[PDB]
Amino acid sequence: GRVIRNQRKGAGSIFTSHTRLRQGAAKLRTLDYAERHGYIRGIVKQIVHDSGRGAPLAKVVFRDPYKYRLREEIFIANEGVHTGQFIYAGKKASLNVGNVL
Amino acid sequence: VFQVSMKANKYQIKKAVKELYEVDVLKVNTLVRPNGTKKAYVRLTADYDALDIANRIGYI
Amino acid sequence: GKGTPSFGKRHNKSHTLCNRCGRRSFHVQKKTCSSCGYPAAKTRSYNWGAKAKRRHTTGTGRMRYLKHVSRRFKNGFQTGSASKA
Amino acid sequence: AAQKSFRIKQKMAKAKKQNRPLPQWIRLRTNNTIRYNAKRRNWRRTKMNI
Amino acid sequence: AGVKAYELRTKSKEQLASQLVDLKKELAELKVQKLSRPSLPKIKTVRKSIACVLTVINEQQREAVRQLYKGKKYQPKDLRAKKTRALRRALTKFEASQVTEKQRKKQIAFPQRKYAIKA
RNA sequence: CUAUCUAGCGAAACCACAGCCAAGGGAACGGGCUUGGCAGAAUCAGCGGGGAAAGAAGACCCUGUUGAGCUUGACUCUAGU
RNA sequence: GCUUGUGACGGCCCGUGAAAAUCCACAGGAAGGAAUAGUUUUCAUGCCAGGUCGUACUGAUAACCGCAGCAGGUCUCCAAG
RNA sequence: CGUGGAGGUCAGUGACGAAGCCUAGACCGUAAGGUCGGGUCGAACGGCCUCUAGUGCAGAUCUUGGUGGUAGUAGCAAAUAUUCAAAUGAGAACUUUGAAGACUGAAGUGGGGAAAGGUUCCACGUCAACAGCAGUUGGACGUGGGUUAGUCGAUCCUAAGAGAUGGGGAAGCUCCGUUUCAAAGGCCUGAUUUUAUGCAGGCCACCAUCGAAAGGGAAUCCGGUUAAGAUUCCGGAACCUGGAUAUGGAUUCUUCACGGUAACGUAACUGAAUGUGGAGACGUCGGCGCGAGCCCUGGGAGGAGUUAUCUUUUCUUCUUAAC
RNA sequence: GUCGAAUUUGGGUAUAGGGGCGAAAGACUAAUCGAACCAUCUAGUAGCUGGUUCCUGCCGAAGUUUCCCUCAGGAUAGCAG
RNA sequence: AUAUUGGCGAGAGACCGAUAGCGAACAAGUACAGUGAUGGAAAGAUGAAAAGAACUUUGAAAAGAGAGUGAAAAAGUACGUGAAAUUGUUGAAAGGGAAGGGCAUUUGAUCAGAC
RNA sequence: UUGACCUCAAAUCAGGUAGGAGUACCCGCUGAACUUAAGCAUAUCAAUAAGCGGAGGAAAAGAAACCAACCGGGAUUGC
RNA sequence: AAACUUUCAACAACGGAUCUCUUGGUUCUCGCAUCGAUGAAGAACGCAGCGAAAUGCGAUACGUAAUGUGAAUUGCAGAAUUCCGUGAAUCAUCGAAUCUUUGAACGCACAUUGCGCCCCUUGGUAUUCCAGGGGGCAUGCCUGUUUGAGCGUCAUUU
Ligand SMILES: [Zn+2]
């Protein structure tokens, strides 16, 4: 016979993912030091559509705790999160939607 | 109108004409001819006339 | 329509000139010569391509340096100059 | 094409130099056998494939 | 005709340099007057004469640096021997004649004795 | 517009040798053989009865200790697991 | 009116419709500065240079590909009454 | 019996003509074949005894080459269509010129390009071959001429991708992998003006490179000019980048501008590291507003056409670039 | 037939032969596809088809036995020189 | 001491002789075909010497007819010789839907021997 | 504080060397199938063709952790 | 009876067999050991008074230098002093050189005749900008050198 269609998918030649317009790697913030003992406040700049998934993504901006820098995060938006919100990320952060606990 | 080396550029052509002929070049135009050779259009300043220089070389 | 009408749609060269051999065998997208194996360091040649290697072997070209080595051997690989014998 | 690389136009100049009949005096040489140019090429008969 | 190389050897590097740029000028009007007349086989002699001048010039500076590097190791690579890549890498005769004392003693004490057999 | 006739230009398929029938016998359906009918140069435009016309070492059928694509609790193995 | 550019809107999407070089701006206050004299070349004027390769022509019932000067094929711009 | 070659011998034949070829001329043999005569030709070749083999053809849809009948035959009929005269020439249905009649009818039989071709472009000479008739003509033949850029492209960036390196596999040609278990790199300002850049320092953490002549992108327009080239030449008028650089201008003793309530304005009007923001930077369809070119049209100033009759008439010029 | 989109198409690029790609016809993968093309192994094997070259003289058959995955073939006896 | 179709330089042959011998005696791995890897021919001979035909004449020319060179143009760069298929011209003969063949002889043409 | 050792770096530091070509003959490594067996699978082609690495004028082997059982021979290579 | 068809002969055609040649091939023997980073083989483009190719060569380009021989080269033209000669030749030989652009191919690249950096020097009123000439700038690895890193580590301090 011949190799079959589910066999031909692992070569990853034409069966790859379409990733030109996908926004980024929507990950959480890093667990460096400022969440394991306190928190850090962040701002939501814009909530945008993501090609490929049906859930909007948020652009959450934090201040760098070690340099004069404005490191920005790519989170999956919670229903209720709005542009201009404040986001708290830490261990002692409150129990409010939008916070990372 | 001069036939110049294929390896030359317009700076060398301008300098070479000055050395050989004691004349000033205003501009240089280059084209590689369809027989794989370089032709140069060397325009003198108004201080010089190419009519009296072409026969000085010996072609006219 | 796979014959004459389709032959009017071939206008993009799959091969260009090859730097190392020049035989219009540099496959463009693969960036590899079909004939001489360029840009591999070695030269493509095979014991089944006996006709092919006979075509591109030592001696089929100008032999710009190896021609004189044979008589240089005969003269003991000497040095200097002849002294007007 | 109009826009072309220097390789192509250089190799066309080679093929334009070589496009003319045999020199006449060569057939007057001693022990000459070449009767004409057997490598003459025209643009309408065979293509250069360059 | 042309130039005689054995006459070029006597002149110094400054006289040859003037002659080379002198011959360069002369070949330039030969080219200018060739395009009018049908044939000019004199350009051949000037071309060869320039080559002869250039060649004789070259040997004068090449020997100047052989004497500059005379009597020392590390000659310039273009002035060394072009015997053969394999032969140039080959071990010298001094380095191929090195012998151990254990064999050196045996060579001194016991060489092949030249013997004949008649009686 | 062709076919038709003219000036110019000018192929191919195919061709053992060839080209009138009846019957006979014959590889059981002859252009040739036998007995008969007959039989007159050189030919032109058509025609589709015949030349079992041409185009292919039958693709059907069968045989061959000749295959291949495919299938499976065939035989013998094997990647992977 | 035709063609084309542009503006402000509307419809549509489980589709919401690239990247970088490059260019500018802002926040910040390092440093450098004034009096018989200093500072700005994001104001104006004034000076010099701008290399290399391409550039002709056809682009098709005759220049490309179809054994050819082949009723085939081959992406596109302008478009009068 | 015959053929290619080898040992021996006929002190064999031959430029006074070897071999070959042709010959409804002769002779021998049952035959394979052998011999002779005549013509043509020009340099080698046989009889006999033996030796040796790439040694004898009618066929293999045999191989290569060559040639017929078919046969002056099939044919040379798609794409509306030619005609008259003059010129040239040996020769004109086909070339040139004029006239007439037509067609493509602007998603053309028009004017430019991309891919491809490569000189086909243009001039002169020219028709043996090719243009399935012709040929004086030609994209043919012979000989030459012709492509001019800071601004148009490439050159730079990156996309999907390709791909070194540090490494890890693989006997191995090589495979993986592009920031990965790397000590991975370079810019500003000082200090000495024995002076090269050692030495004062701080800053930087991304990370080879290749990959689009339709993506992104610094800047040139008009007129004229050739047989053949032009946003490239010439004349004029511009702009951009880079680099040196002086004057005018601007500003200060309230040291680094003022005015307006404001949105904001101007000729400028110190601002290193560092950080933030914008442009680059973006779908498609629907209808609506505006601009540009064209189209239509009036008066007027010119030119051409019709005019038996009519037509203040029909056609045509009245343009304005980048900056 | 369809003709505003599951639309048409150029250029770039990715996918390579028991492999690709397939809105699935065993379709397409350079006029080649139910396993492309190129060279080599390779003068691949054939119990089967076709052909197999000078003369004369003398002699002159067989289609039958037995065994064989044997029945279009061989071995064997016989017939022949 | 052994091996050797590659390289270099030699000596040979009961080898082949231009469809043979290497694919290639020659501007042969060339012309040419394919995108490509690859595939791949044809093609030697005037004469001792070009002495390669001066000159006249017909034709637009190519060429023809003379003249000439040469031992020979029955050697004219379509060139040593120059077969067959196939073709033209002249001569001979036969032919009512094939032709060709055999035995025998008439007729016509030609011919050897013998004297 | 200073001077060593070990280990690991850097330099367009001084001097070098490997590559690639050719590859008939040699030393390895990988490795078929056509075919024969009147089928065919072990077997055979064949420890071969193809593929890869590595040399020389020869290579390789080579002076026994050998052969023998004789009254012992005595590196290897080749006939 | 012509024509036409068929057969043969002569002459003339078409065609390239045969015959006779051979600077070629093939096979066997003999002798020799010699490519390349000091840049091979190969490729591209160029070079002659008149060459397209083959053959030769590389911007010093059918070649320069050196040695030998000793009068040519030749299709045409030209040059003659170089002809009792330190000298013709498309001569042989070849020990000195040049050897464009590439190529294992090496500053980075390459479907581009694209893009940098360092050293010396020259010009534009210039270490910085532009241009020219010359020399450089690959990787693995060995030996040596020099500047270093590591609480890996010894000794010494204060
Ligand atoms: Zn190549």
Side-chain angles (χ1 to χ4, degrees), chain A residues 69-84:
Chain A
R69 183 178 182 270
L70 208 54
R71 171 145 63 80
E72 167 178 336
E73 303 286 344
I74 302 281
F75 287 16
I76 305 178
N78 267 353
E79 183 177 1
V81 178
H82 48 268
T83 183

Side-chain angles (χ1 to χ4, degrees), chain E residues 74 77 80 85 89:
Chain E
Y74 301 136
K77 265 197 183 182
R80 289 182 226 198
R85 183 215 185 75
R89 268 77 164 281

Side-chain angles (χ1 to χ4, degrees), chain E residues 73-108:
Chain E
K73 58 197 303 201
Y74 301 136
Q75 290 288 325
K77 265 197 183 182
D78 81 330
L79 293 180
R80 289 182 226 198
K82 188 57 176 65
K83 311 187 290 308
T84 285
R85 183 215 185 75
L87 258 56
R88 176 196 297 128
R89 268 77 164 281
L91 199 68
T92 76
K93 74 188 299 184
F94 178 86
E95 293 179 353
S97 66
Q98 304 292 114
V99 71
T100 69
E101 52 179 1
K102 194 200 164 155
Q103 295 301 116
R104 178 71 275 172
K105 285 173 172 202
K106 298 187 176 180
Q107 293 194 8
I108 297 314

Side-chain angles (χ1 to χ4, degrees), chain D residues 6 11 17-18 20 22-23 25-26 28 30:
Chain D
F6 187 76
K11 186 180 289 293
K17 296 187 186 79
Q18 298 175 306
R20 91 291 188 279
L22 188 66
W25 51 268
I26 277 166
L28 293 180
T30 306

Side-chain angles (χ1 to χ4, degrees), chain E residues 27-48:
Chain E
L27 196 153
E29 72 262 10
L30 267 67
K31 281 192 288 209
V32 170
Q33 81 198 356
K34 170 177 181 261
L35 56 85
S36 68
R37 292 183 291 113
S39 174
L40 182 62
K42 187 173 180 312
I43 294 173
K44 187 175 178 182
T45 68
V46 177
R47 281 195 286 111
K48 305 301 180 195

Side-chain angles (χ1 to χ4, degrees), chain A residues 4-15:
Chain A
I4 54 186
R5 171 182 57 186
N6 47 49
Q7 284 189 277
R8 259 168 54 235
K9 266 159 178 219
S13 59
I14 58 160
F15 296 107

